[PDB]
UniProtKB/Swiss-Prot annotation, chain B:
Belongs to the Fanconi anemia group I protein family. The lineage of its organism: Eukaryota, Metazoa, Chordata, Craniata, Vertebrata. The keyword Protease does not apply. The keyword Transferase does not apply. The chain holds residues 385 to 960 of 1338 of the full protein. Plays an essential role in the repair of DNA double-strand breaks by homologous recombination and in the repair of interstrand DNA cross-links (ICLs) by promoting FANCD2 monoubiquitination by FANCL and participating in recruitment to DNA repair sites. The FANCI-FANCD2 complex binds and scans double-stranded DNA (dsDNA) for DNA damage; this complex stalls at DNA junctions between double-stranded DNA and single-stranded DNA. Participates in S phase and G2 phase checkpoint activation upon DNA damage. One of its GO terms (biological process) is DNA repair. Disulfide bonds: none annotated. This is Fanconi anemia group I protein.
Amino acid sequence: GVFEELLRTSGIILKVGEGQNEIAVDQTAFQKKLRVALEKHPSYPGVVNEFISGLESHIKDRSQFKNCLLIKLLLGIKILQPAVVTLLLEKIPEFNFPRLIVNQFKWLDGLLDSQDLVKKLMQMLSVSPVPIQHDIITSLPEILEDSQQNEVARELSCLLKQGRRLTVPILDALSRLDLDAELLAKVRQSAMTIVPSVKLEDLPVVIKFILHNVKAADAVEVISDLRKSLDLSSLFDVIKLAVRFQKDVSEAWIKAIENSTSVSDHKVLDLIVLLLIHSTRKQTEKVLRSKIRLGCMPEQLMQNAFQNHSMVIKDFFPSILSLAQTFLHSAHPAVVSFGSCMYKQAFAVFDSYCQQEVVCALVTHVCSGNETELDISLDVLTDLVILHPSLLLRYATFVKTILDSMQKLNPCQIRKLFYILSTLAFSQRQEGSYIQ
Amino acid sequence: VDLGFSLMESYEMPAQQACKLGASILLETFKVHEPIRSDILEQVLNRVLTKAASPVSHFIDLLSNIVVSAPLVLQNSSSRVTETFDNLSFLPIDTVQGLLRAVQPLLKVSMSVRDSLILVLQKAIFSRQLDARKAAVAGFLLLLRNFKILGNEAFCLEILGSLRRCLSQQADVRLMLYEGFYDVLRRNSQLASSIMETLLSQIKQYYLPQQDLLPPLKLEGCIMIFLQEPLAHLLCCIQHCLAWYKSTVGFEQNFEEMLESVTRRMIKSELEDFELDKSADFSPSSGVGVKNNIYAIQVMGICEVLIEYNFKIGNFSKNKFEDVLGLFTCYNKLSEILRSFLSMGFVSTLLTALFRDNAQSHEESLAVLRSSTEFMRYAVSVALQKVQQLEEMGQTDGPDGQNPEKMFQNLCKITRVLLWRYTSISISLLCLEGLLRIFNTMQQLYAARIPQFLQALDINVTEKAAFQIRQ
């Protein structure tokens, strides 16, 4: 054949079957050799179209196409540029088969007819199913030259307005790709509207998309909207990453809770975000302390929040320790009650190391300080042994060591101390011989 | 060590004193505590890449200071550098250049880090956003200039082709990459031939090769509204490239022929040839007007570059200086309707030539230039503008504009001419303003170098200072 003879004439030899292409070890060597040989072959102007028919022979052989898996170098000829596009458009609906074609075309050699390619891609995606459409959308930012990004953005927005299943990959592609400032407001509004109606699987990706692009003042108001819309939902890593990479988002959150939450009760996620912000200036801790002193965030809901949100407690330890230390010295009854219930909940943390650390912190607080602190420490200890003595028996060595060093205290304190030792010893009489 | 670290966060002027105090403590305790090197390295490396909330350039300076002392220390604590590299193009505030310059000793010895960094650069160059792209190409220039190609020639050709693919980009990246091209040009040799071929390919599009037609530059192509082709910087870079090629000793024949043709057409040119002729032709805040402003500032830059080139080659020739005066007349005629691309060495040589240029060999060549008072005013004005740039910023534009020794030598040269002109006996008050700016700038920046400067204009600083006050 003409194509077979031309391929072996120069450039890269086309091994039949599973054999690799016989050419030099260089990407540009093929373009220098085979393209020059084809140009020399192009003395007959009318045979090139016949050579295109010969190229169709290379398209005819399925084994030849599989051996092709080069294809990019052959498709790089300026004269035969539309031929490759026509072949791809014909083989698209015929049939991860199109994934390889998209990868080869994505970030490929440019062409002046990129508008035609964009229109053909849109037409194919109009009929293509969900996964092929998603693959085409992911390949779109590589394919697009970025000059006509506005029209692509408008088309993507229109498709996002209708396609329920394609919202996630389209939003991800738009976030990855650049966009005009005027369309930014429309994108933000569209993303914010679908938050209550968004699916659970694509929820964190959409939340990252809305929280990453916008860095303006009006997002504070959007935070107020996300005070309500996000609360309706009822991985968590993307929020932490966005807050870590965006301190302005932290300031916006702080201002949003300061202005709006004061006269709209509160929410569990608000307290969790407060803890996360405090863990990561530390003004949020002071604001939360002021709010609790005013009488916000009742501990009755805090107990349910700590019980249900096991991951947040298991997420990282020292936030609870810092909060307990801050609330222990509170001058109001609400603050000290909150700290007491907070340590009571923290004792229920499944981590044995964290549990013993919390018990050690309680013993340290009981060790010295104000007498009221010792009284509340003994009160929470008697509440604990009323709750479960077996769990406290595990760390009984520290309690016994602390009790042995009781230099002085009120007679009621000594009565309570020897009561807790006696109760722990006798209730644990199976293994309490070492304490009696 | 805990106090030394905490002082950095405390500082966020006595605050500068506290930050310097923390840097000194960390440097001293690293120099002293031999067993504790790894802990300090891990702590500072983790703190460096924690979060880009604010400028952390002083942390990068500390990183350079700690790593330059102990070269092998970085090799032991490796495999964390790649994690930092994974997210370098997030908040680049020019700290990426310092970080790369600091960790270059790690890169040259280890190939795995080189492969990872090349992967990150490949990710950056194909990115579709300009903000990451600028940092990517800026680091890419440092990568290219770091490794010598004297003897990986095939690797150099491939990576240069990868860089050359970047020429179709935004305006800012095109603007910035020419300085890196000049640096890597001065660093290497075969890269000179390849990159000179690339520049010829770039300029052949805009040259418009012909004869007997006005406006040789096809400026209308780069109208937009926003600019995307800094022609003046391109011509300046090409001029310096050709000058270095001639110094270090066909495309050069084509270059010199094109430059001769365009300057010959330019002297035989007028504003009628250009779109903007005179009187009411443009206005601010109007589409055609904002368009025409771009052509105006661009062709002013081109005129400056051609004046520099013609003075460079025109070794004491009346006709060349007449042509230079013609370009100056065009530049001033356009200027009256409404920075500069000159070099330090050129400005110093020009000032020394104009003032105190006593030599019988001159056939009144400088006499033609000395007739135009506007030329003298412009010559002093460019020096004032560049000195103001040096005072306000760290370094001035143009080639060799960041080596401190060259700047100090050029300042020492300029000050003598300005003092001589004022003492010889408007022009004079402008020289006084220049001298004031020199003295304030050198007081602020070059502290230790004060004595040698006082030796240059002619030990105890007070005697020479009192001599100048007596003057």
